[PDB]
Amino acid sequence: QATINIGTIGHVAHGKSTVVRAISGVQTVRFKDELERNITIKLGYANAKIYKCQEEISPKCQRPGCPGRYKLVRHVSFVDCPGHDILMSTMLSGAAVMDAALLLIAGNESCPQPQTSEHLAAIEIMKLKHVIILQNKVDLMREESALEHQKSILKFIRGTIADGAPIVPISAQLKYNIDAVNEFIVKTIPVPPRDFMISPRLIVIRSFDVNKPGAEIEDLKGGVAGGSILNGVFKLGDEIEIRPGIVTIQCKPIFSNIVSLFAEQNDLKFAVPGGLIGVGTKVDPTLCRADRLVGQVVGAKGHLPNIYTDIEINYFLLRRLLGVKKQAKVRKLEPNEVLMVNIGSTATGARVVAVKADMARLQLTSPACTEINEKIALSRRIEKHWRLIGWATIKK
């Protein structure tokens, strides 16, 4: 199945979807009539092939001269998030689901673009320094201007946790120069190991009913959860608890036996981790209605994640903020103020109980589940929409 969760990052109206299309052919759709013209809310999904010519996009070597057929390397799946500074929660969720990143910078649009920088920062925070950098709108720029842009980018990427991350000049519309990108996908991104015995944990980003308009109820379908595994091969025929729960104010975890564990385009026996998977469960498709299973944790039955509202956070912050042009000073965190705490996939609205030296105690208005220590990206409301302040770990 899908071997490595590779994410796509860039500015809004630059062409992440376009890039995906160029790579795979699989469309992110762009939907709900708002997003048909403009920008997606959900993650965009695509399945790209790597079968190398060693003597590729398709498993045949008729194209690159030598008739010695395309030698199977990998199959990779995309994690394409919204690159808008309003919808950052989704991006954050994607980030602690990904194994590696793909940057997208346009030629004619500037080098210190705010959103892109923010994305980069997020990636750095959440252990995602494996970034393949792509020059995108180069089918517009001069023989000198492009070079200048590249130089500027290089200059920028000197103090960042990205040091010598590779840059490729592609056209997402004209279909050129993606060979290099493909090569890098095997070269610069090795897949981090993901075993059998590391306790099975599924991180849900999407809720899906496949209940088509027109059918009869004597021919029914269950609930499908679109979520990623980063530990534990889920096999067909297992019982599950989804632990952030269902709301009564108290919450109670949801129990579902596996109908299917579906990856690629064809349903499989297994779901080997480091991939984003559509899990058919006996759970109602009415709870998989639109975007209900977003930021929920799934464990195999006989397991104890903990649903915390009162949290011990170890926090770290910036000197100067991101999301804006206008990079504003980080004023100190203020008590009993609504922050957004992004933990793996959750985007919970939290109130500050205490501020110490490097630790903070937080109240959650919506309960999140901590199994391990859990990776956090933090966010705040200063300029209406949510800006990225810093990062944390749950000290548990």
Place this chain on the structure above:
Amino acid sequence: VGLPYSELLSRFFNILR
């Protein structure tokens, strides 16, 4: 490195419509 990139860029420039 931005010089195994330079070659790529050159190639791209060569094969534009």
